[PDB]
Scaffold this active site. Structure first.
Site, mmCIF file in Angstrom:
data_model
loop_
_atom_site.group_PDB
_atom_site.id
_atom_site.type_symbol
_atom_site.label_atom_id
_atom_site.label_comp_id
_atom_site.label_asym_id
_atom_site.label_seq_id
_atom_site.Cartn_x
_atom_site.Cartn_y
_atom_site.Cartn_z
ATOM 1 N N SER A 106 41.186 -45.994 -19.896
ATOM 2 C CA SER A 106 42.282 -45.273 -19.246
ATOM 3 C C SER A 106 42.763 -46.228 -18.145
ATOM 4 O O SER A 106 41.981 -46.928 -17.519
ATOM 5 C CB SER A 106 41.572 -44.044 -18.573
ATOM 6 O OG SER A 106 42.650 -43.316 -18.016
ATOM 7 N N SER A 107 44.041 -46.261 -17.913
ATOM 8 C CA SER A 107 44.635 -47.115 -16.880
ATOM 9 C C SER A 107 44.248 -46.637 -15.484
ATOM 10 O O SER A 107 44.305 -47.466 -14.558
ATOM 11 C CB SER A 107 46.156 -47.186 -17.055
ATOM 12 O OG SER A 107 46.674 -45.882 -16.922
ATOM 13 N N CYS A 108 43.777 -45.396 -15.396
ATOM 14 C CA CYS A 108 43.361 -44.885 -14.099
ATOM 15 C C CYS A 108 42.105 -45.539 -13.648
ATOM 16 O O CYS A 108 41.572 -45.251 -12.518
ATOM 17 C CB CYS A 108 43.313 -43.305 -14.101
ATOM 18 S SG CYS A 108 42.181 -42.718 -15.330
ATOM 19 N N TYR A 135 35.476 -39.941 -13.152
ATOM 20 C CA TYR A 135 35.920 -40.223 -14.497
ATOM 21 C C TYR A 135 35.997 -41.738 -14.713
ATOM 22 O O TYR A 135 35.585 -42.249 -15.769
ATOM 23 C CB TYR A 135 37.267 -39.541 -14.710
ATOM 24 C CG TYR A 135 37.932 -39.859 -16.017
ATOM 25 C CD1 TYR A 135 37.464 -39.261 -17.167
ATOM 26 C CD2 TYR A 135 39.070 -40.644 -16.121
ATOM 27 C CE1 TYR A 135 38.101 -39.445 -18.383
ATOM 28 C CE2 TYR A 135 39.725 -40.823 -17.310
ATOM 29 C CZ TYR A 135 39.220 -40.222 -18.445
ATOM 30 O OH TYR A 135 39.908 -40.350 -19.645
ATOM 31 N N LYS A 139 34.202 -44.206 -17.429
ATOM 32 C CA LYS A 139 34.928 -45.038 -18.383
ATOM 33 C C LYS A 139 34.589 -46.507 -18.231
ATOM 34 O O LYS A 139 34.416 -47.192 -19.260
ATOM 35 C CB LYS A 139 36.436 -44.851 -18.246
ATOM 36 C CG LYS A 139 36.886 -43.509 -18.784
ATOM 37 C CD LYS A 139 36.703 -43.372 -20.292
ATOM 38 C CE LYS A 139 37.554 -42.321 -20.933
ATOM 39 N NZ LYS A 139 37.341 -42.340 -22.426
ATOM 40 N N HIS A 178 50.300 -34.184 -15.249
ATOM 41 C CA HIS A 178 50.917 -35.262 -16.002
ATOM 42 C C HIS A 178 52.430 -35.026 -16.159
ATOM 43 O O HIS A 178 52.846 -33.999 -16.671
ATOM 44 C CB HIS A 178 50.242 -35.434 -17.351
ATOM 45 C CG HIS A 178 48.788 -35.785 -17.198
ATOM 46 N ND1 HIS A 178 47.809 -34.996 -17.706
ATOM 47 C CD2 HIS A 178 48.169 -36.776 -16.535
ATOM 48 C CE1 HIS A 178 46.625 -35.507 -17.442
ATOM 49 N NE2 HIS A 178 46.806 -36.594 -16.729
HETATM 50 N N1 LIG Z 1 47.358 -43.040 -20.029
HETATM 51 C C1 LIG Z 1 46.044 -43.212 -20.261
HETATM 52 O O1 LIG Z 1 45.486 -44.145 -19.654
HETATM 53 C C2 LIG Z 1 45.285 -42.316 -21.088
HETATM 54 C C3 LIG Z 1 45.780 -41.026 -21.303
HETATM 55 C C4 LIG Z 1 45.168 -40.151 -22.242
HETATM 56 C C5 LIG Z 1 44.007 -40.554 -22.913
HETATM 57 N N2 LIG Z 1 43.548 -41.776 -22.756
HETATM 58 C C6 LIG Z 1 42.311 -42.073 -23.404
HETATM 59 O O2 LIG Z 1 42.099 -41.246 -24.501
HETATM 60 C C7 LIG Z 1 40.873 -40.506 -24.279
HETATM 61 C C8 LIG Z 1 41.107 -39.168 -24.918
HETATM 62 O O3 LIG Z 1 42.184 -38.474 -24.298
HETATM 63 P P1 LIG Z 1 42.911 -37.264 -24.922
HETATM 64 O O4 LIG Z 1 44.166 -37.090 -24.114
HETATM 65 O O5 LIG Z 1 43.062 -37.474 -26.431
HETATM 66 O O6 LIG Z 1 41.858 -36.032 -24.631
HETATM 67 P P2 LIG Z 1 41.829 -34.687 -25.358
HETATM 68 O O7 LIG Z 1 43.179 -34.481 -26.021
HETATM 69 O O8 LIG Z 1 41.485 -33.850 -24.300
HETATM 70 O O9 LIG Z 1 40.797 -34.930 -26.451
HETATM 71 C C9 LIG Z 1 39.430 -35.292 -26.318
HETATM 72 C C10 LIG Z 1 38.685 -34.612 -27.518
HETATM 73 O O10 LIG Z 1 37.249 -34.804 -27.345
HETATM 74 C C11 LIG Z 1 36.542 -33.690 -27.790
HETATM 75 N N3 LIG Z 1 35.300 -33.577 -27.076
HETATM 76 C C12 LIG Z 1 35.036 -33.537 -25.719
HETATM 77 N N4 LIG Z 1 33.756 -33.276 -25.464
HETATM 78 C C13 LIG Z 1 33.142 -33.196 -26.714
HETATM 79 C C14 LIG Z 1 31.809 -32.888 -27.088
HETATM 80 N N5 LIG Z 1 30.825 -32.662 -26.203
HETATM 81 N N6 LIG Z 1 31.535 -32.881 -28.415
HETATM 82 C C15 LIG Z 1 32.538 -33.071 -29.297
HETATM 83 N N7 LIG Z 1 33.834 -33.246 -29.035
HETATM 84 C C16 LIG Z 1 34.085 -33.317 -27.706
HETATM 85 C C17 LIG Z 1 37.414 -32.538 -27.730
HETATM 86 O O11 LIG Z 1 37.153 -31.213 -27.848
HETATM 87 P P3 LIG Z 1 37.423 -29.916 -27.028
HETATM 88 O O12 LIG Z 1 38.794 -29.865 -26.499
HETATM 89 O O13 LIG Z 1 37.082 -28.802 -27.921
HETATM 90 O O14 LIG Z 1 36.605 -30.041 -25.753
HETATM 91 C C18 LIG Z 1 38.877 -33.094 -27.647
HETATM 92 O O15 LIG Z 1 39.189 -32.735 -28.973
HETATM 93 C C19 LIG Z 1 40.832 -40.501 -22.750
HETATM 94 O O16 LIG Z 1 39.487 -40.306 -22.370
HETATM 95 C C20 LIG Z 1 41.276 -41.921 -22.330
HETATM 96 O O17 LIG Z 1 40.216 -42.872 -22.652
HETATM 97 C C21 LIG Z 1 44.033 -42.597 -21.742
#
Ligand SMILES: NC(=O)c1ccc[n+]([C@@H]2O[C@H](COP(=O)([O-])OP(=O)(O)OC[C@H]3O[C@@H](n4cnc5c(N)ncnc54)[C@H](OP(=O)(O)O)[C@@H]3O)[C@@H](O)[C@H]2O)c1
Ligand SMILES: NC(=O)c1ccc[n+]([C@@H]2O[C@H](COP(=O)([O-])OP(=O)(O)OC[C@H]3O[C@@H](n4cnc5c(N)ncnc54)[C@H](OP(=O)(O)O)[C@@H]3O)[C@@H](O)[C@H]2O)c1
EC number: 1.1.1.271
Lengths: 315, 315
Positions: A106-108, A135, A139, A178
């Site tokens: 993540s860029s954060c 967080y 990461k 966001h």
């Molecule tokens: N601009 C950026 O820099 C930026 C922005 C967004 C994402 N990203 C990267 O993408 C990653 C994912 O982001 P996202 O936006 O896709 O998040 P998300 O939409 O919230 O998705 C994360 C997924 O992980 C699952 N998960 C979490 N805990 C789990 C567990 N214990 N067992 C199994 N599944 C689990 C989920 O399930 P539940 O919802 O059911 O908990 C959710 O489906 C971030 O962490 C970051 O590294 C970076």
């Protein structure tokens, strides 16, 4: 034999984007487990999954993610859960001879007062934003787990650091911290209500960077699938992550006015400059990714329009 | 009711030092488990221990620790094992209503080019020494786990950052990268052999800081047992750790000549200045600890002498 690809967190925003692209790939067999089927916090369950499912590659898109209120309210949950998910997957993958993994940063994660645009070498050069510190530390520990496994065991655990993302499957609630999903929803409602104005805190002058999640997914698959020798030539073992973004900034003003146009709002976008702005500029330097032969395809205008259409179909 | 105190890693150098002091305390009941009885990497086992043993306080002195060769050769083991031990203990403690914990950092956690002497605020201000990076990231993640649990759940998980330690139960092998035990053993052997000289790499000019482990243990118990309001007044929630050391430097030259005297070596200590020195000065700023009312009691000369006598009794 198709490669067996586990997309951890496949119902998430990023995980689902990667799934929609790989679901088209006859050379790939997707292995997917919902949270109810596999709790990634449970070390035993994660090891048992890898010991029985013959995985070739992992996209580590599972994480505990949230906005400003969530990160400041549940800091222990953000650091603990991300450290455990990452540790459990990377260690289980290694113990089961899974050689290829793509981790998402993540860029954060970059220092608050980083040099702009932020090259990969800004990692660890200074203190973190407090809101995101727990967080961010988990990461950074994930990146360093990947690098350590690469160095000790000769693994191929790569990592990407996305900029701000937007697109399908986001949280389109007006109180989201966001800005893209929040503004899309706020302008949508103001358009429905015929509100005379929509007031955004701050002056509108700060410059930020945004990338559509389908571009993010494409870049991630691109980075995953580069031959190892090419990836090694464009990274260093202890500075291995690759920024994923546009490398181009736009003012908050530009973003808000563009969203207003995309939604068809005919009231006024108003900025309240009595509220503070964050830093004047925050964006990634994407030289490594461009040198690796990947360039984003979705412009802001086109991405906001398609994102809004996805929202309209999923209200 | 005596407080039930779990000293994790109680056979280690630091853990055993804390045990020798608390074993004297009629107000304390020690709860101790060897690695064979409780593998701190096993989340389930750690939770079961806390769910059955009614712990009041934890001293987290269990860790995967080593010198320069070990840290560069087994980086994955250093980051993974420390992240898991720390995560498992802190989360299990919290889930079982254990309110008091003392975590141990390491001075190697500070940035390579930190301002000297290093105040607690140097944490995260710049890049790490590469040799110790994996270990350091897991230790920083441990501090941040403690702070996050404190902030979210109102826990009292404190942390101490020791300087270089020496004393009983160290590794007294001539190839140890840690200079005190290595030099004690090298000079001991050179004295037994009547060797004409002992050559130390470098010029001898760098200044470093050393603290006997019994002082470390005393400071750790001191910090653990301060009333919470006093600890809060002298720390910040997201800058909570306390440096433990002397705050006084000595040259490598002084250290080597002192060790030579302590062992009764009558040959020559020789420095080979064709080999590179590290940075000119590295030491902790111990203002917070002194403001908290703890000052070390063991001088270098006295500590080296008693350490050598312990070695002589344990060869
Ligand atoms: N601009 C950026 O820099 C930026 C922005 C967004 C994402 N990203 C990267 O993408 C990653 C994912 O982001 P996202 O936006 O896709 O998040 P998300 O939409 O919230 O998705 C994360 C997924 O992980 C699952 N998960 C979490 N805990 C789990 C567990 N214990 N067992 C199994 N599944 C689990 C989920 O399930 P539940 O919802 O059911 O908990 C959710 O489906 C971030 O962490 C970051 O590294 C970076
Ligand atoms: N100058 C400094 O800054 C400095 C120097 C030294 C220590 N310290 C701090 O003190 C900590 C401890 O250092 P130390 O010198 O006391 O290390 P140590 O002597 O090596 O002791 C650590 C102990 O932890 C145990 N342990 C490790 N993994 C375990 C597991 N999976 N389950 C159960 N027990 C396990 C041990 O058992 P086994 O040996 O059987 O594995 C060992 O008894 C360091 O991590 C650092 O935070 C800092």
């Amino acid at each position: 034999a198709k490669q067996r690809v586990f997309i951890a967190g496949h119902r998430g925003m990023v995980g689902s984007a990667i799934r929609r692209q790989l679901e088209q790939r006859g050379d790939v067999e997707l292995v997917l487990r919902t949270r109810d089927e596999l709790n990634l916090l449970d070390s035993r369950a994660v090891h048992d999954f890898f010991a029985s499912e013959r995985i070739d590659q992992v996209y580590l898109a599972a994480a505990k993610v949230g906005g400003i209120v969530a990160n400041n309210t549940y800091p222990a949950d953000f650091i603990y859960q991300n450290m455990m998910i990452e540790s459990n997957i990377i260690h289980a993958a290694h113990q089961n001879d899974v050689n290829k993994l793509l981790f998402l940063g993540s860029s954060c994660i970059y220092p608050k007062l980083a040099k702009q645009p932020m090259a990969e070498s800004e990692l660890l050069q200074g203190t973190l934003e407090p809101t995101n510190e727990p967080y961010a530390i988990a990461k950074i520990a994930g990146i360093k787990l990947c690098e350590s496994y690469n160095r000790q065991y000769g693994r191929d655990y790569r990592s990407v650091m996305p900029t701000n993302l937007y697109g399908p499957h986001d949280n389109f609630h007006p109180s989201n911290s966001h800005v893209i999903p929040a503004l899309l929803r706020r302008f949508h409602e103001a358009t429905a209500q015929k509100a005379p104005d929509v007031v955004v805190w701050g002056s509108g002058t700060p410059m930020r960077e945004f990338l559509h999640v389908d571009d993010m997914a494409a870049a991630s698959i691109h980075v995953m699938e580069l031959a190892h020798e090419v990836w090694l030539e464009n990274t260093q073992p202890m500075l291995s992550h690759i920024n994923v973004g546009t490398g181009v900034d736009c003012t908050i003003r530009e973003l808000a006015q563009t969203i207003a146009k995309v939604v068809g709002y005919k009231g006024r976008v108003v900025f309240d400059a009595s509220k503070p702005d964050g830093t004047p500029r925050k964006l990634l330097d994407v030289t490594r990714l461009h040198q690796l032969g990947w360039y984003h395809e979705i412009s802001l205008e086109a991405g906001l329009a398609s994102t809004y259409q996805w929202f309209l179909e999923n209200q």
